[PDB]
Write a protein that binds this ligand. Structure first.
Ligand SMILES: *[C@@H]1O[C@H](CO)[C@@H](O)[C@H](O)[C@H]1NC(C)=O
Lengths: 127, 911
C-alpha cells in the first residue's frame, strides 16, 4: 500500500555544537526506501556531504538524520524525508533553527540598561 | 467543701428591697464570716482555686469563634465555585469515552478549586486570630481595689473570687455582686438592668445590694462579693457602616458589568464555532458523532465561568476588614488601643478635637515655681516659716510622696494623689526640711474638699489651717505676715495693689493660685506660684495637626486667664487676630430665648470663635458638641473627636462621632462609653490616631487600583483573543492562579502598610468625595494600555518575532503550547511588577522606596515570583504551560521591568 509517516518533529531548536536528531517513522507495505532532502528556494534539494557532518541510518520503517557540529550560517532551514516504495512515496517536514552567535546576551544588557535608567531618574528627582 | 452556700446560686441576691429585713437572720458581717471581713485576704493561692471550683469562676466566654473546618465548609458554597466543579466533572466526563493524556484539565480544575478555597479559608482564619489578639488584651486592664493585707493593690477582674472585699468609689464598675458594709452616700446607675436611668441611694438601711454591669455615679464605699461568673445575675440573663457603602455599591456595579461581559464572550464563541463550521465553511456534518460537539460546548462554557471568576472580585469589602485588622494589632504598640471597630476609619475625617487641658496637653507633673512669703515676686524659691511648714506638711493623711523612683539616676520622681498637693510638698522638700518627721505629729477635724465654698481645711494642734484659692479664700483673709512677721490688716489696697497689681502679673498668668491660709477673718501665710509643663512634643503636634485642617478647641473647667496662658503658650490662640475665650457662664447666656438653647443662633454663633471654653461643665461640653454635629452652615460639617474622663462624661462623649478616653487617671464609666482608650494620655497619640485613620482610607484605594487593573486587562485579553481566534489564551487553571494573585493574596499583600508623615499634608476628606479619583483613573488606564499592547504584540506577532511556531489555533487534545507560555509568563510577571507600582497614589516616584517596613509585602511578592518560577518549568501539561527556557525568561523579565518604567513615565503629563 501507500507509505504513511507516523511520528516526527514539526520543529527543532538546537544550539552551537550539538547534534540535531531528525527522524521519520513510516507504516505500510512494503517497507519504503528513505531519502532525506532539503528545501531550498522553493525546490527540494539533495544533501551534499561536503561538510562531513551528515549521518543517515536507514532501517525498514525507521530513519534518523543526525547533523553533528551545527553552525548558524548554513545548517538552519527546512528538511524533509521521503519514504518511497514501489507503490508510492510519502513526505513530512522537519524544520531546524539554531539560536547561537551570542547566544542570549542582548536583553541581559537590556535589563542592566533599564535598571540604570530608572535608578538615574530616582537619583535626579530626590535632589 | 464547707461554706454557707445554702442558696447555692441565689445566695442572697434575689430582689430589692424587701430582702434587707431578713438576710440569713439579718446580720451582714455574720454572713461575711460564714462566707470568708475587714480586713484580711488569703494566704493560700490554692484556696482561691478551691472557691473557683466551689462557686465559682468569673471569666464568661462566648462561643468562639468558629472552627477552621467551619470556614472551609463556608467558602465551598459560592455558586460560581460549585458550577466550576460541575463543569470540570463533565469536562473529564466527555473524555471517558470518545471515538491518551486528555485527562488532566478537569482534575486540575477540581484540585485547584480545592486549593483556592483552602487559601481563602486560611486567610479568614488568620483574620479572626488577630481580632482575638485584640480582644484578649482589651479584656485585661480592668482592675479593682481589693482589701488584701492592708497593702491594697489592683488585681485583674477575672481573678477575683467570693469572700474578698472590694473598696469602690465613684467612677468604676461592679464586677461581682454583693453586700455593703461601710459608708457612704454612694449613688449608682442601674441603666444596664432597669429602664430607670436614674440615681439610687445605697446604705445599710435600704438596699445593701450591688449589681454587676452597673457603674457608680457618685460617693464611695466598701462591699463584700456575693457572686461571679455565669452564677452572677447579669450572666444568667445573658444566658436566657460609613465607608463600606461605597464599596458594596462599587462591587455590585462591577458584578453586573462582568456578568454581562462573560455572557458576551460565551455567545460570541458558540456563534463563531457553529457558523464557522456548520452553516459556513460547510458542508454540514450533522451526524452520529455527537459528544465531541457537546465537548466543545463544555469548553466554551468553561471559558465563560473562568472569566466570571476574574470579573467578579469575590470579597471586596474584606479589604477594609483585613487592613483594619492588621492596623489594630500594630496600633496597639503605639499607645493607642481601639475598642470599637468604626472609630478607626471615621477618624479619619476629623475636623475638630474638643480636648481637655489637665493631663492631656500638659505633663501633669507640676512644680511650685514662684511664691509670696517675702512680700513679693522674688524668683524660684522664721517661726512663722515653721508655721508655714506646719501648713504645707500637715495638709492631709494621704499625701503619699514615695520618693525614690525609677532607676535612681535622674531626679524625676512621681507621686500619688491630687498633684497640686504633691507639687506643694515636693518643693517644700526642696527647702531642705523633713516633712516626714512632722507628719508624725499625729492627726481634730481635717475637712475634705466638701465645703460651702469648697476648700480643704484642717483643725490641728488649736492651729486651724486651710488650703484653697486666692479668689476663693483671700477674700476672707484679714492680714499679711509682715516680712517674717507682723500683721498688716487688709483693704482694697490688697485687692487692687496685690491681687491686681501683683497677683495678675503672674507668669502668663498661670497657674491655679491657692493660699494655705491661717484661720484664727484669716491671715495671709503666702500664696503660690504654680506651673505645669507643656509636653515637649505638643507645640509641634498642634501645628502639625493645625495644618491638616483639624481645628483644636480646648475645653476645660478652669479659670480664667489660665486657659489663655496655656492656649497662647501651646499655639492654639495665635495672637494675631482671633478668637475670643469665655468665662464659663456666658455660653449658657448665648443664647436662650426663652430657655432656650436655640440651635439657630448656637449653630450660627459664635461658631469658629470658641477655641477656649474655660470653666466648663460636662453639660457645657455636651451643649457645645451637640451644637457642632448638626445641620449647620458649610454642609460639609463636621466630624468631631472629643476627649474626656469625668464621671459625668456619659452623653457628650457618647454623641460625638469618635470618642477618646484617658487611661492613666481615667474612670471606668468613661472607658465603657468610649470608643478609643489612650494608654499614656499624650495628645500626640491623637495625632497618631489621625494618621492611622488616614492610612486605612488610603490603603483601600491603594489595593483597589491594582485589583481594577488586573480585572480590566484580564477581561479585554479574554474577550478580544476569544473573538479573533476561537479560544482565550489563558487556560482555565492559570486563570484561577491570576484570581489567587489578585484577590486574596493581593489584598493581604499591599493592604498592610505602615503610615508615613506624608498623610498629614492634605486637607481632610469629605464623606461624599468619590472613591476612584482622577490620578487613580490615570494609573488604571495607563497600565491597562501598556499591558494590552504587550500582550497583543506577544499574542499576534511573537512567532515571526524570535521563536517559535504559532500556538493559535489549536485542537482540543492537546499539546500544551510554547507560545502561550510566553503570553502567560509576560502577563503574570507584568502584574507582579505592577504590584510595586500600585503602591503610590497621590503622586510618584519612589518605587522601590522603601519596601522594607513591610515583612508581608516583601515575602508575598518574592514568594509569588518563586512559585511561578516553579510553575513554569514544572507541571507543564497539567497547568497548560511547557518547559520554558532562557532566553525567553529574560525577555519576559525585560518586559516586566518595562512596565516598571512606563508607569513611572505616567507620573508626568498631569491635568
Ligand atoms: C558523509 O561522509 C562521512 C565520512 O565518511 C560518512 O561517515 C557519512 O556516513 C556520510 N553521510 C552521508 C549521508 O553520506
Amino acid at each position: 500500500a501507500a507509505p504513511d509517516i507516523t511520528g516526527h518533529k514539526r520543529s527543532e531548536n538546537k544550539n552551537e555544537g550539538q547534534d540535531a536528531t531528525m527522524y521519520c517513522k513510516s507504516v505500510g507495505y512494503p517497507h519504503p526506501d528513505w531519502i532525506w532532502r532539503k528545501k531550498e528556494n522553493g525546490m527540494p534539494m539533495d544533501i551534499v556531504n561536503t561538510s562531513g557532518r551528515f549521518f543517515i541510518i536507514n532501517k525498514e520503517n525507521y530513519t534518523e538524520l543526525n547533523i553533528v557540529n551545527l553552525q548558524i550560517t548554513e545548517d538552519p532551514g527546512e528538511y524533509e524525508c521521503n519514504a518511497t516504495n514501489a507503490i508510492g512515496s510519502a513526505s513530512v517536514v522537519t524544520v531546524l533553527r539554531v539560536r547561537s552567535h551570542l547566544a542570549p546576551l542582548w536583553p541581559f544588557l537590556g535589563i542592566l540598561a533599564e535598571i540604570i535608567i530608572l535608578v538615574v531618574i530616582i537619583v535626579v528627582y530626590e535632589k | 467543701g464547707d461554706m454557707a452556700n445554702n442558696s447555692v446560686a441565689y445566695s442572697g441576691v434575689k430582689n430589692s428591697l424587701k430582702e434587707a429585713n431578713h438576710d440569713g437572720d439579718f446580720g451582714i458581717t455574720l454572713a461575711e464570716l460564714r462566707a470568708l471581713p475587714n480586713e484580711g485576704l488569703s494566704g493560700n493561692p490554692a484556696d482561691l482555686e478551691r472557691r473557683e471550683a466551689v462557686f465559682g469562676k468569673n471569666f464568661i466566654p462566648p462561643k468562639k469563634p468558629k472552627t477552621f473546618l467551619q470556614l472551609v465548609w463556608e467558602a465551598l458554597q459560592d455558586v460560581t465555585l460549585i458550577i466550576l466543579e460541575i463543569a470540570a466533572i463533565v469536562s473529564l466526563g466527555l473524555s471517558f469515552y470518545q471515538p491518551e493524556t486528555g485527562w488532566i484539565e478537569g482534575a486540575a480544575i477540581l484540585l485547584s478549586v480545592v486549593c483556592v478555597v483552602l487559601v481563602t479559608a486560611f486567610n479568614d482564619w488568620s483574620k479572626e486570630k488577630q481580632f482575638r489578639g485584640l480582644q484578649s488584651r482589651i479584656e485585661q486592664e480592668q482592675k479593682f481595689t481589693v482589701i488584701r493585707g492592708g497593702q491594697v493593690i489592683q488585681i485583674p477582674v477575672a481573678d477575683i473570687t467570693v469572700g474578698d472585699i472590694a473598696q469602690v468609689k465613684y467612677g468604676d464598675l461592679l464586677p461581682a455582686d454583693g453586700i455593703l458594709i461601710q459608708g457612704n452616700d454612694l449613688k449608682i446607675d442601674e441603666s444596664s438592668l432597669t429602664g430607670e436611668s436614674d440615681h439610687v441611694k445605697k446604705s445599710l438601711d435600704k438596699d445593701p445590694l450591688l449589681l454587676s454591669g452597673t457603674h457608680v455615679m457618685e460617693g464611695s464605699g466598701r462591699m463584700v462579693v456575693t457572686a461571679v461568673g455565669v452564677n452572677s445575675q447579669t450572666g444568667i440573663i445573658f444566658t436566657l457602616s460609613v465607608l463600606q457603602g461605597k464599596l458594596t455599591k462599587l462591587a455590585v456595579q462591577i458584578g453586573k458589568a462582568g456578568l454581562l461581559m462573560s455572557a458576551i464572550t460565551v455567545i460570541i464563541l458558540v456563534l463563531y464555532f457553529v457558523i464557522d463550521t456548520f452553516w459556513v465553511q460547510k458542508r454540514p456534518w450533522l451526524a452520529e458523532c455527537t459528544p465531541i460537539y457537546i465537548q466543545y460546548f463544555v469548553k466554551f462554557f468553561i471559558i465563560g465561568v473562568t472569566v466570571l471568576v476574574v470579573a467578579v472580585p469575590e470579597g471586596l469589602p474584606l479589604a477594609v476588614t483585613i487592613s483594619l485588622a492588621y492596623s489594630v494589632k500594630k496600633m496597639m504598640k503605639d499607645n493607642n488601643l481601639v475598642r470599637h471597630l468604626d472609630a478607626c476609619e471615621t477618624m479619619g475625617n476629623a475636623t475638630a478635637i474638643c480636648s481637655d487641658k489637665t493631663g492631656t496637653l500638659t505633663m501633669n507633673r507640676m512644680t511650685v515655681v514662684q511664691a509670696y512669703i517675702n512680700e513679693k515676686h522674688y524668683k524660684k524659691v522664721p517661726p512663722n516659716i515653721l508655721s508655714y511648714l506646719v501648713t504645707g506638711i500637715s495638709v492631709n493623711c494621704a499625701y503619699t510622696s514615695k520618693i525614690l523612683p525609677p532607676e535612681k539616676e535622674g531626679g524625676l520622681p512621681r507621686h500619688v494623689g491630687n498633684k497640686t498637693e504633691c507639687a506643694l510638698l515636693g518643693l517644700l522638700l526642696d527647702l531642705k526640711r523633713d516633712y516626714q518627721d512632722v507628719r508624725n505629729e499625729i492627726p481634730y477635724k481635717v475637712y475634705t474638699f466638701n465645703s460651702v465654698r469648697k476648700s480643704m481645711s484642717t483643725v490641728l494642734k488649736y492651729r486651724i489651717f486651710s488650703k484653697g484659692a486666692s479668689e476663693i479664700i483671700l477674700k476672707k483673709c484679714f492680714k499679711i505676715l509682715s516680712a517674717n512677721g507682723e500683721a498688716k490688716v487688709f483693704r482694697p489696697r490688697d485687692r487692687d495693689d496685690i491681687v491686681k497689681t501683683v497677683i495678675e502679673p503672674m507668669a502668663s498668668e498661670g497657674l491655679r493660685t491657692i493660699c494655705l491660709a491661717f484661720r484664727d477673718g484669716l491671715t495671709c501665710i503666702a500664696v503660690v506660684g504654680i506651673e505645669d509643663p507643656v509636653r515637649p512634643e505638643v507645640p509641634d503636634a498642634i501645628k502639625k495637626c493645625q495644618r491638616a485642617g483639624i481645628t483644636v478647641r480646648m475645653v476645660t473647667g478652669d479659670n480664667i486667664n489660665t486657659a489663655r496662658a496655656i492656649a497662647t503658650k501651646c499655639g492654639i490662640l495665635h495672637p494675631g487676630e482671633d478668637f475670643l475665650c469665655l468665662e464659663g457662664k456666658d455660653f449658657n447666656r448665648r443664647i436662650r430665648n426663652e430657655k432656650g438653647e436655640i440651635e439657630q443662633e448656637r449653630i450660627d454663633k459664635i461658631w469658629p470663635k470658641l477655641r477656649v471654653l474655660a470653666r466648663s461643665s460636662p453639660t457645657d461640653k455636651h451643649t457645645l458638641v451637640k451644637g457642632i454635629i448638626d445641620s449647620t452652615v458649610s454642609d460639609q460639617r463636621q466630624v468631631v473627636a472629643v476627649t474626656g474622663d469625668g464621671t459625668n462624661d456619659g452623653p457628650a462623649l457618647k454623641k460625638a462621632d469618635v470618642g477618646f478616653a484617658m487611661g492613666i487617671a481615667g474612670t471606668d464609666v468613661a472607658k465603657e462609653a468610649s470608643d478609643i482608650i489612650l494608654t499614656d494620655d499624650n495628645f500626640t497619640s491623637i495625632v497618631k490616631a489621625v494618621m492611622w485613620g488616614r492610612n486605612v482610607y488610603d490603603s483601600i484605594s491603594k489595593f483597589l487600583q491594582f485589583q481594577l487593573t488586573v480585572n480590566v486587562v484580564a477581561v479585554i485579553v479574554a474577550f478580544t483573543g476569544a473573538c479573533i481566534t476561537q479560544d482565550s489564551p489563558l487556560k482555565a487553571v492559570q486563570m484561577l492562579w491570576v484570581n489567587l494573585i489578585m484577590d486574596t493574596l493581593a489584598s493581604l499583600a499591599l493592604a498592610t502598610e505602615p503610615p508615613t508623615e506624608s498623610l498629614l499634608l492634605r486637607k481632610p476628606y469629605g464623606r461624599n468625595k468619590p472613591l476612584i479619583s482622577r490620578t487613580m483613573m490615570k494609573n488604571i488606564l495607563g497600565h491597562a494600555f501598556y499591558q494590552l499592547v504587550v500582550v497583543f504584540t506577544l499574542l499576534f506577532a511573537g512567532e515571526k518575532f524570535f521563536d517559535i511556531d504559532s500556538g493559535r489555533n489549536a485542537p482540543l487534545h492537546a499539546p500544551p503550547s510554547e507560545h502561550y507560555t510566553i503570553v502567560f509568563n509576560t502577563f503574570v510577571l507584568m502584574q507582579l511588577f505592577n504590584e510595586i507600582n500600585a503602591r503610590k497614589i497621590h503622586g510618584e516616584r519612589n518605587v522601590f522606596e522603601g519596601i522594607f517596613n513591610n515583612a508581608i509585602f516583601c515575602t508575598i511578592v518574592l514568594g509569588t515570583f518563586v512559585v511561578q518560577i516553579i510553575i513554569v518549568q514544572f507541571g507543564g501539561k497539567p497547568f497548560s504551560c511547557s518547559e520554558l527556557s532562557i532566553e525567553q525568561w529574560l525577555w519576559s523579565i525585560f518586559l516586566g521591568m518595562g512596565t516598571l518604567l512606563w508607569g513611572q513615565l505616567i507620573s508626568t503629563i498631569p491635568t
